[PDB]
Amino acid sequence: AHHNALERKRRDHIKDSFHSLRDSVPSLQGEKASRAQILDKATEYIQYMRRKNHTHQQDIDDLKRQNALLEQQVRA
């Protein structure tokens, strides 16, 4: 009995965690998805977001250079 109780809790915690992950992925938010689909779409989303934040940082670095140059032209 104790062992079956441990096993059902284990399965329920995995179910809960799949739901939470699915609800975190925009491409799945509100849709029907198998476990494989949730995993694969989360993988794609994280990979995309990690690269997207690099793109943002590149733009930030470009802008910081642009503003320093403009400050130098105001000083001159």
């Binding site: 284990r10 915690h13 995995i14 965690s17 799949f18 939470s20 992950l21 975190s24 992925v25 476990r35 494989a36 995993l39 694969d40 989360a42 993988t43 989303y45 994280i46 990979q47 977001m49 990690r50 997207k52 934040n53 943002h56 940082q57 733009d59 930030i60 802008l63 910081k64 642009q66 503003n67 403009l70 400050e71 032209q73 105001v74």
Partner: protein, 89 residues
């Protein structure tokens, strides 16, 4: 009973193939989480929960970067406007 044996063995192969596909999917997700990358003992529940937390973290990081860039763009417009005022005085 031979039909039940053939059916059982067939389903056993199909279930193994599905488990192996699912494992590859778990490992691909695991490998997007730096703390878990290539950890072959990472449990399913840990991969799932750390993926959700990592998504929240990367989204918060994006918001931080968007805020920084917005302020930099406002500053750029302010500097361009100051330079134009100065050169046209």
């Amino acid at each position: 009973h031979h039909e039940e044996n053939v059916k059982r063995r067939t389903h056993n192969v199909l279930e193994r193939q599905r488990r192996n596909e699912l494992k590859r999917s778990f490992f691909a997700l695991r490998d997007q989480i730096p703390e878990l990358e290539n950890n072959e003992k990472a449990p399913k529940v840990v991969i799932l929960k750390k993926a959700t937390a990592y998504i929240l973290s990367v989204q918060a990081e994006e918001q931080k970067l968007i805020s920084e860039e917005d302020l930099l763009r406002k500053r750029r417009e302010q500097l361009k406007h100051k330079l134009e005022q100065l050169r046209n005085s």
